[PDB]
Structure formats: structure tokens, C-alpha cells
Amino acid sequence: VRILDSALVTAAQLAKRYLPYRRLPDSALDLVDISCAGVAVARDSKPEELDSKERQLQLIQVEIKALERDEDADSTTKDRLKLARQKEASLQEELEPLRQRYNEEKHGHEELTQAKKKLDELENKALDAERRYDTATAADLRYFAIPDIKKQIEKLEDQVAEEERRAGANSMIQNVVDSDT
Amino acid sequence: VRILDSALVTAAQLAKRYLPYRRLPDSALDLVDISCAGVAVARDSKPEELDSKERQLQLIQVEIKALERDEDADSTTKDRLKLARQKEASLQEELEPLRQRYNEEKHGHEELTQAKKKLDELENKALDAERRYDTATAADLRYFAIPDIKKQIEKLEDQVAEEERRAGANSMIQNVVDSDT
Numbered sequence: 109v110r111i112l113d114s115a116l117v118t119a120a121q122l123a124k125r126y127l128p129y130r131r132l133p134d135s136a137l138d139l140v141d142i143s144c145a146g147v148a149v150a151r152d153s154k155p156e157e158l159d160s161k162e163r164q165l166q167l168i169q170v171e172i173k174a175l176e177r178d179e180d181a182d183s184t185t186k187d188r189l190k191l192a193r194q195k196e197a198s199l200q201e202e203l204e205p206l207r208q209r210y211n212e213e214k215h216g217h218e219e220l221t222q223a224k225k226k227l228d229e230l231e232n233k234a235l236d237a238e239r240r241y242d243t244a245t246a247a248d249l250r251y252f253a254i255p256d257i258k259k260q261i262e263k264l265e266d267q268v269a270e271e272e273r274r275a276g277a278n279s280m281i282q283n284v285v286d287s288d289t
Numbered sequence: 290v291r292i293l294d295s296a297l298v299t300a301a302q303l304a305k306r307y308l309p310y311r312r313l314p315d316s317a318l319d320l321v322d323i324s325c326a327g328v329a330v331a332r333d334s335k336p337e338e339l340d341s342k343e344r345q346l347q348l349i350q351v352e353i354k355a356l357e358r359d360e361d362a363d364s365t366t367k368d369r370l371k372l373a374r375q376k377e378a379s380l381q382e383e384l385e386p387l388r389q390r391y392n393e394e395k396h397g398h399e400e401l402t403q404a405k406k407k408l409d410e411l412e413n414k415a416l417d418a419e420r421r422y423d424t425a426t427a428a429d430l431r432y433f434a435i436p437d438i439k440k441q442i443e444k445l446e447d448q449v450a451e452e453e454r455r456a457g458a459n460s461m462i463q464n465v466v467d468s469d470t
Contacts, residue, residue, distance in 0.1 A: 169431075173429065173431065174432055
């Protein structure tokens with residue numbers, strides 16, 4: 109999840125203001141980790157669009173069996189079903205690209221997660237190399253390796269594809285907004 | 290038994306306003322379960338009234354058994370049990386159809402319970418399916434089993450058959466009363 113710098117400031121200010129008797133750095137963090145977890149959950153399904161369409165599709169399946177599995181199936185009494193089937197197709201066609209679009213948005217976050225993780229592992233290694241005065245591996249990490257991952261992260265952040273309409277071409281937020289979140 | 294919506298309102302208002310010893314969710318729910326149980330006794334007061342009349346039948350049964358066989362059983366001394374028997378029969382003629390009806394009314398509700406239980410089991414399978422768009426194992430249940438059960442429930446409503454001599458032919462439905470109960 110992306111986190112605004114101002115969210116760390118705001119979370120710390122809020123934690124003291126709404127829970128002054130609770131440890132400030134824990135409370136500020138809990139506020140953040142809880143809200144991070146929260147948006148991460150929402151992003152698992154974006155059900156407002158996906159669950160709604162999946163339900164509509166199943167309701168159609170009910171109408172389909174209710175009308176299809178019959179002798180009256182050959183009468184317009186039940187053959188009116190074809191209209192529901194047409195709606196099914198429309199929902200399947202709208203739904204699948206939403207689904208995949210959402211998967212792409214998720215993947216962008218997974219890529220960022222791993223790029224940042226890799227950078228930190230290189231840093232962990234660099235720090236040991238520095239205390240060992242291991243110039244060779246300190247150099248392996250400080251030069252090229254860390255800068256590489258750093259640039260990959262920057263590129264991955266730009267992959268959000270910011271457009272004038274919103275902060276990303278992406279429809280979902282998956283971020284920690286200083287005040288809203 | 291049917292419950293007035295206003296009884297839910299009254300139970301909740303009552304619990305809040307006058308029963309501070311117990312928290313509102315349960316206190317109101319307890320008022321509902323309790324009031325319903327009080328009513329269950331009232332619905333089972335079909336038997337309490339039928340049984341009050343049965344107590345008259347037992348005063349009669351005892352008089353009859355006390356007088357049923359003896360050396361002078363054929364004397365009007367003991368044969369007076371026939372008068373007790375005339376009353377026995379008179380009460381049974383009223384009581385038996387009221388009792389049988391009570392059982393029918395109860396069996397109506399038994400079936401409503403069983404029918405609804407299955408309706409709901411099938412609906413949870415449908416819910417599983419609606420959310421993930423199953424198209425088959427739930428569709429086969431939504432198909433007919435759902436609307437057939439629903440229709441049986443509606444047919445049982447018709448058996449309630451409200452009538453001029455009593456709201457509800459199914460007279461044991463002592464609709465839980467918001468106020469009095």
C-alpha cells in the first residue's frame with residue numbers, strides 16, 4: 109500500500125489528540141497498520157462492482173434454469189429467458205475486464221512490494237558488508253545493485269499511470285491518505 | 290407465532306426505558322423470547338382452556354371410575370355417573386375439534402419451520418453461488434426447490450385463512466402483542 113508522508117504526520121498528531129494516554133508511536137502506527145490492512149482488504153474484491161455483477165449473473169442462472177428446464181421452455185412463457193441470457197453476456201463482458209483490470213492494479217502493488225523488499229535486502233547486506241569493512245560486497249550493493257532496484261521502484265511507481273482524471277489510470281486507491289484514510 | 294412489528298419496537302423501548310440491569314441488545318431480545326414464550330404458554334393455553342374443561346372432564350372421569358363398577362352399579366345411586374357422562378360427551382364434542390385444530394395449526398407451523406429451514410439452507414448454497422457465479426449446483430436448487438418451498442409457505446398462509454369468527458382460522462396464532470404481551 110502506498111503511504112503518504114503526511115499520513116505519518118497526521119497519524120502521529122491524531123494519535124496524541126484522540127488517544128493522548130496511549131503510547132504515541134504505537135498508536136500512530138496501529139492507526140496506520142490497521143488502515144493499511146483495511147484498504148488491502150477492500151482491494152481483494154472491489155465487490156461493489158464485482159459482487160454486484162456476479163450476483164446479477166447468478167440471478168440470471170436461476171431464471172435460466174427456472175425457464176430452461178421445462179416443457180414450457182418452448183413457449184414464450186419461458187422462452188422470454190433469452191433476454192436474461194443476453195444480459196448474462198453483457199455482465200460477463202463488463203465483469204471480466206473489471207476483474208482483470210483489478211488484478212493488474214493488484215499486480216502493480218505486488219511489484220512495488222517486492223521491489224522495495226529487494227532493495228531493503230540489498231541494504232541489509234550492505235550494512236553487514238560495511239561493518240565487516242568488506243569493500244567488495246559493500247561496493248556490489250552501493251553501486252549499481254541498490255541504484256538498480258531504486259530505479260525499478262521509481263519506474264513501478266510511475267506504472268500507476270497517473271492521468272489528469274485521477275492519481276493513476278487505476279480505479280482503486282490502495283493508499284493511506286493523510287486525513288481521509 | 291406471528292409477532293407484531295410494534296412488539297419489537299415496544300420491547301426495545303421498554304428495555305431501554307425501564308430495564309437498566311441488562312444491556313439493550315439482549316434485554317430487548319430477551320423481551321422478545323420471553324414475550325414469545327409467554328405467548329407460547331398463551332398459545333398452549335389452547336390446552337390450558339381445553340384442559341380446564343378437561344379438569345371438568347376429570348372430575349367426571351373420577352366420578353365415573355368411582356361409580357363404574359360395584360355391587361350396586363346398576364342402582365341410580367351409582368348410575369348417576371351417566372349424567373357426568375352426558376357432560377363428558379358435551380365437553381369432548383367441543384374440545385376434541387378445538388384440540389385437533391390446535392394440532393393442525395401447530396403442524397401448519399411445523400411445516401412452515403421445516404419448509405423455511407430448507408428454503409434457507411438452499412439459499413445459503415445459492416448465496417455461495419451468487420457471490421462466485423456457480424451456475425450449476427446452486428442453480429439446480431434455486432430451480433424449483435426454492436419457489437416450490439416458497440409457494441408451500443404461501444399455501445400454508447392460505448391455511449391460516451382469516452375468518453369472521455376469529456382473525457386467523459389458525460386461531461392459536463396469538464400474534465405477540467406489543468402492548469399486552
